[PDB]
Amino acid sequence: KWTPPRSPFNLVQETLFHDPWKLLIATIFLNRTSGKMAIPVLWKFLEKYPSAEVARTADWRDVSELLKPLGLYDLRAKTIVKFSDEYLTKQWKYPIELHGIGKYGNDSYRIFCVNEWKQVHPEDHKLNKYHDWLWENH
């Protein structure tokens, strides 16, 4: 029952924190990509694949088709599939242990999905904005 405060910045993370898989996917989408472009394709992807269970099952060629032309859509597709399978099948404590998840992924998890945001030191423009704001209004 950790609820990241709503912020004047409306990071999609603030919207998905209640389901780590989605929030994590979201980070693969946003990872070094405009929210301009990534957010519309994210919602179309969650609409079509609303859980890891369904995701891990799909064939990346179709996932890619749907991610086109997001950029490295092939690579992102294969990642999403493999990360979704690992998410369910592996016994993990932090999502950094998972395929496709890096610092951005793991930072986002620990601010929003679990309560560890004081120990986190983001280096993402949007993310720091959340984190600095939340230091102050704390």
Side-chain angles (χ1 to χ4, degrees), residues 38-43 45-71 73-74 76-90 92 94-97:
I39 304 170
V41 189
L42 174 57
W43 297 132
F45 170 92
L46 296 169
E47 278 144 10
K48 190 171 163 177
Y49 299 95
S51 78
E53 280 85 352
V54 171
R56 66 170 293 188
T57 261
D59 159 5
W60 65 275
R61 290 148 204 286
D62 298 327
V63 186
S64 178
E65 189 63 23
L66 174 85
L67 296 183
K68 222 160 270 199
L70 208 51
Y73 46 81
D74 277 335
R76 279 191 248 245
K78 304 199 213 197
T79 304
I80 281 165
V81 175
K82 184 168 180 149
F83 149 77
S84 300
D85 172 29
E86 290 211 339
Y87 176 94
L88 299 165
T89 44
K90 271 186 198 273
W92 56 272
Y94 288 87
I96 183 90
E97 325 170 13

Side-chain angles (χ1 to χ4, degrees), residues 8 12 21-22 24 73 85 90 107 109 111 116 136:
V12 73
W21 180 76
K22 301 197 158 180
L24 294 170
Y73 46 81
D85 172 29
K90 271 186 198 273
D107 288 336
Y109 182 71
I111 304 174
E116 297 184 3
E136 292 153 59

Side-chain angles (χ1 to χ4, degrees), residues 121-125 127-137:
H121 295 110
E123 40 186 10
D124 175 78
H125 190 234
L127 251 180
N128 262 289
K129 293 207 156 167
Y130 188 82
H131 192 231
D132 284 341
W133 172 87
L134 162 67
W135 262 116
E136 292 153 59
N137 304 61

